[PDB]
Amino acid sequence: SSTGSIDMVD
Amino acid sequence: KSPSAQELKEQGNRLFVGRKYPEAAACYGRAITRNPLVAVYYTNRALCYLKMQQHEQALADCRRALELDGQSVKAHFFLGQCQLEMESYDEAIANLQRAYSLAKEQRLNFGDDIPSALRIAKKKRWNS
Fold first, then answer.
1. Using the chain's own numbering, where are the disulfide bonds (chain B)?
2. What is the full DSSP assignment across B68-80?
């Protein structure tokens, strides 16, 4: 969980 | 008085996390009205449209985002995700591979997200 998913808004 | 583009992108982001996807997409559209040269407003709205199954709208937004920022990793990823849900497998894989290259070039770390998506893109293609 240390990286934010790419399936998310900026 | 009025919301700024930054306020509206912020509202849309909170609405997105709230699973209020049509409401989020409208907020991003209002941000675009206030500044139509921000690629991120379009890739954000593209991802709302993906969640809403409006793939054709999502495609359009990704294409507009690429005119504004040709390097956008998420523009390529969401484009590949969209073409994947539309049974357009070779185009999806190309775009996911391009997101992977751009992310490496830009030192972005989404963990295994892009390799995983590529594996599913190729698996779904093989199963079809």
1. none
2. H-TT-HHHHHHHH
